[PDB]
Design an enzyme around this catalytic site. Structure first.
Site, mmCIF file in Angstrom:
data_model
loop_
_atom_site.group_PDB
_atom_site.id
_atom_site.type_symbol
_atom_site.label_atom_id
_atom_site.label_comp_id
_atom_site.label_asym_id
_atom_site.label_seq_id
_atom_site.Cartn_x
_atom_site.Cartn_y
_atom_site.Cartn_z
ATOM 1 C CE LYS A 48 -3.645 -1.805 3.017
ATOM 2 N NZ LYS A 48 -3.942 -3.235 2.703
ATOM 3 C CG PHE A 89 16.584 -4.793 4.903
ATOM 4 C CD1 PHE A 89 17.468 -5.857 4.779
ATOM 5 C CD2 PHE A 89 16.574 -4.075 6.091
ATOM 6 C CE1 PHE A 89 18.322 -6.209 5.826
ATOM 7 C CE2 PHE A 89 17.412 -4.417 7.140
ATOM 8 C CZ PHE A 89 18.290 -5.486 7.007
ATOM 9 C CG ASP A 94 8.987 -11.112 9.238
ATOM 10 O OD1 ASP A 94 7.923 -11.420 8.642
ATOM 11 O OD2 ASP A 94 9.113 -11.159 10.483
ATOM 12 C CG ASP A 98 8.120 -14.584 10.863
ATOM 13 O OD1 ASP A 98 8.892 -14.863 11.806
ATOM 14 O OD2 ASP A 98 7.612 -13.448 10.742
ATOM 15 N NE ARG A 103 5.638 -9.992 3.697
ATOM 16 C CZ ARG A 103 5.271 -9.725 4.950
ATOM 17 N NH1 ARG A 103 4.342 -8.812 5.198
ATOM 18 N NH2 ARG A 103 5.822 -10.354 5.973
ATOM 19 C CG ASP A 165 8.765 -11.849 16.428
ATOM 20 O OD1 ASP A 165 9.198 -12.802 15.742
ATOM 21 O OD2 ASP A 165 7.577 -11.463 16.390
ATOM 22 C CE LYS A 191 6.123 -7.969 15.829
ATOM 23 N NZ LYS A 191 5.699 -9.322 15.352
ATOM 24 C CG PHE A 230 0.110 -0.963 11.988
ATOM 25 C CD1 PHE A 230 -0.729 -0.584 10.950
ATOM 26 C CD2 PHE A 230 1.187 -1.788 11.699
ATOM 27 C CE1 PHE A 230 -0.506 -1.005 9.647
ATOM 28 C CE2 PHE A 230 1.417 -2.225 10.395
ATOM 29 C CZ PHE A 230 0.571 -1.833 9.366
ATOM 30 C CG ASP A 234 0.619 -7.702 11.093
ATOM 31 O OD1 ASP A 234 0.417 -7.627 9.861
ATOM 32 O OD2 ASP A 234 1.451 -8.500 11.583
ATOM 33 C CG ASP A 235 0.023 -9.645 16.395
ATOM 34 O OD1 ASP A 235 0.808 -9.613 15.427
ATOM 35 O OD2 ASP A 235 0.405 -9.423 17.567
HETATM 36 C C1 LIG Z 1 10.720 -6.946 10.809
HETATM 37 N N1 LIG Z 1 9.276 -6.842 11.016
HETATM 38 C C2 LIG Z 1 8.797 -6.012 11.954
HETATM 39 C C3 LIG Z 1 7.424 -5.902 12.152
HETATM 40 C C4 LIG Z 1 6.547 -6.663 11.379
HETATM 41 C C5 LIG Z 1 7.070 -7.521 10.415
HETATM 42 C C6 LIG Z 1 6.196 -8.384 9.528
HETATM 43 C C7 LIG Z 1 4.929 -8.934 10.180
HETATM 44 O O1 LIG Z 1 4.066 -7.854 10.574
HETATM 45 P P1 LIG Z 1 5.227 -9.991 11.638
HETATM 46 O O2 LIG Z 1 3.845 -10.486 11.996
HETATM 47 O O3 LIG Z 1 6.178 -11.059 11.143
HETATM 48 O O4 LIG Z 1 5.845 -9.211 12.778
HETATM 49 P P2 LIG Z 1 4.051 -9.891 8.898
HETATM 50 O O5 LIG Z 1 4.908 -11.078 8.524
HETATM 51 O O6 LIG Z 1 2.752 -10.283 9.563
HETATM 52 O O7 LIG Z 1 3.945 -9.004 7.703
HETATM 53 C C8 LIG Z 1 8.451 -7.580 10.255
HETATM 54 MG MG LIG Z 2 6.219 -12.291 9.481
HETATM 55 MG MG LIG Z 3 8.015 -11.836 12.046
HETATM 56 MG MG LIG Z 4 1.958 -10.683 11.319
#
Ligand SMILES: C[n+]1cccc(CC(O)(P(=O)(O)O)P(=O)(O)O)c1
Ligand SMILES: [Mg+2]
Ligand SMILES: [Mg+2]
Ligand SMILES: [Mg+2]
Ligand SMILES: C[n+]1cccc(CC(O)(P(=O)(O)O)P(=O)(O)O)c1
Ligand SMILES: [Mg+2]
Ligand SMILES: [Mg+2]
Ligand SMILES: [Mg+2]
Lengths: 341, 341
Positions: A48, A89, A94, A98, A103, A165, A191, A230, A234-235
């Site tokens: 976005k 990056f 991530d 994960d 994505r 995390d 994070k 936020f 996301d969670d």
């Molecule tokens: C480095 N970093 C910081 C905050 C968020 C995310 C990415 C995530 O928000 P995460 O749930 O893994 O934290 P996403 O995979 O759900 O997109 C990555």
């Molecule tokens: Mg993630």
């Molecule tokens: Mg993560």
């Molecule tokens: Mg997430």
């Protein structure tokens, strides 16, 4: 409203970002420079753009219109893209860590046939591009060093948060005693909150000559709270969002994460419900993930989230009344519009 | 001689590096800060320290003894450690990407039970520590920005080189037509020569107030050639070195790498020998790796390397005669002693 109306100019600037980052043209590195192009195109496009747009929007609202010449605007768009490159990056790495599948509505970069763990280096290159753009566009400006240090410090804070995390979510290992509210809030502050919310506003601020410690501290007070909400959102969307809208498949339960949902679950569960969570959380089996979801719904967690979003919205508005001045409240309000929709 | 005689002070400074990097003490991040400590201890200790020592040695030789106060010496040791932290960052990632087993006489960080791909984030943290130390120790100095930009530019060049290394070595895929001398020289210049040789000298130079473009260009002329030889030596030792001395198991043949050895092999092989290489290179099977080694020895590649090392040594000495002035030749000579032993 200001985001949809800066977007098109912002997104089109991308081909210029790419062209300039592709003009180390030492013909010997051509193959590498072509790989970088592919990396940028796959990994910086398709989201976005809200973080980078916040730089552009905030810049227009903080800088005197008479100081918004063609060149200072180009600089604003580039710095916006720098924030998007930092996000690219972080996401590429991530997604490896994960074990994610998709994505932004496509297969994750590292899952692409022929990429694999080469994506570690691709992610580091994207990071390097930030500082390359800052130099090419901003090196003559009074705020050059401010910006470099802001991006570096933002990266360090995010990496510290990623560390927490990951430590709180050891693979294949129970105990839920780890998943507390205190712990949760520290994770997401580091994070998420710094780079997603403080960084892009702070960047616009430095660009506008607003470098005072006290003003940055006040802005940070609002922005870190927005960031906490936020990440909570996301969670929630990891389990309860529609992948066709989020663009990604959720992995929090199988990855054993300290999600907001698990923390709220733990606060509410009977000892019997605790045991179900404990037997089922942190594991790859679809039937086990489905039992956790069922416990969450039994506990009305989607209703708890809707109520928290309302409380959170009111709290953030209260903070903007307290802490916004002397910056235009619109700066924060535009942002809150974006996330609380 | 100057390296063994600066070493002990340099190595002992490490506990101070760690202590200062561990004093974000926000108690909430304690667990993360403890993980960082473990990362530093495992990954920045146990090598020869030659890159960081080169900063300290060069500093003593370039700076007026009357300007070598306690504080400027501390700054030199810290910047030396910054170069070692950059190496640690690169090796942790490179070991994941090259699928390596051991580094510096122990199991690779990512192969450690309970680490795995979490090491991607650990590597990024090590990188972040560089810029954290530069700020804590050097932010008041005239050369602060010079150093930041040098470290960032060095990282970008190395990542570009890593990109070429990885592109030229696609997993599970033949053709040897890729492995040329031209290609080889570009890879090692970018992946190795800048950060291993230019970076630590250049850093000492900026610290000594030597910031002239022409002097950096001359220093670079010698240092990039040393770096090329050093990577050629690293490739030779990958197959023919003793792991108890190198500290690591070699993977170049199984990883399908554009090694100096394969390039030299290709230059010498009969069409029949070409086919053996082609049927056997780039594959995990011990018996296949052993056939490639046998071809290399049939072609007297260890003898070709010993002769190249001599030619290379003489060439580098010629460059130091040409290009050293006005810096003390000892600076380059100490370095050449280290690698040509
Ligand atoms: C480095 N970093 C910081 C905050 C968020 C995310 C990415 C995530 O928000 P995460 O749930 O893994 O934290 P996403 O995979 O759900 O997109 C990555
Ligand atoms: Mg993630
Ligand atoms: Mg993560
Ligand atoms: Mg997430
Ligand atoms: C990032 N980077 C640049 C140069 C060298 C290495 C590391 C190596 O020299 P590589 O043979 O992989 O190139 P090593 O594994 O043999 O130690 C890593
Ligand atoms: Mg390697
Ligand atoms: Mg390698
Ligand atoms: Mg090697």
């Amino acid at each position: 409203d200001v985001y949809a109306q800066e977007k098109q100019d912002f997104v089109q600037h991308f081909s210029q970002i790419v062209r300039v980052l592709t003009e180390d043209e030492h013909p010997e590195i051509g193959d590498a420079i072509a790989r970088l192009k592919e990396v940028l195109e796959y990994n910086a496009i398709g989201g976005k753009y809200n973080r980078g747009l916040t730089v552009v929007v905030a810049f227009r609202e903080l800088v005197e219109p008479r100081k918004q010449d063609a060149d200072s605007l180009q600089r604003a768009w580039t710095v916006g893209w720098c924030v998007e490159l930092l996000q690219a990056f972080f996401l590429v790495a991530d997604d490896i860590m994960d074990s994610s599948l998709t994505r932004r509505g496509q297969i994750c970069w590292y899952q692409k046939p022929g990429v694999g763990l080469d994506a570690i280096n691709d992610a580091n290159l994207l990071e390097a591009c930030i500082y390359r753009l800052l130099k090419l566009y901003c090196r003559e400006q009074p705020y050059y060093l401010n910006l470099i240090e802001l991006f570096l410090q933002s990266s360090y804070q995010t990496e510290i948060g990623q560390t927490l995390d990951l430590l709180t979510a050891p693979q294949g290992n129970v105990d839920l005693v780890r998943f507390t509210e205190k712990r949760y809030k520290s994770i997401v502050k580091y994070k998420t909150a710094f780079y997603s919310f403080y960084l892009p506003i702070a960047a616009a601020m430095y660009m506008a000559g607003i470098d005072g410690e006290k003003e940055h501290a006040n802005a940070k007070k609002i922005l870190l709270e927005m960031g906490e909400f936020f990440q909570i959102q996301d969670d929630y969307l990891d389990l309860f969002g529609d992948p066709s809208v989020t663009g990604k498949i959720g992995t929090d339960i199988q990855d054993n994460k300290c999600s907001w949902l698990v923390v709220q679950c733990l606060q509410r569960a009977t000892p019997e419900q605790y045991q179900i969570l404990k037997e089922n959380y942190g594991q790859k089996e679809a039937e086990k993930v489905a039992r956790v979801k069922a416990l969450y719904e039994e506990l009305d967690l989607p209703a708890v989230f809707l109520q928290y979003e309302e409380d959170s919205y009111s709290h953030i508005m209260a903070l903007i009344e307290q802490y916004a001045a002397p910056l235009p409240p619109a700066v924060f309000l535009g942002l809150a519009r974006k996330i609380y929709k």
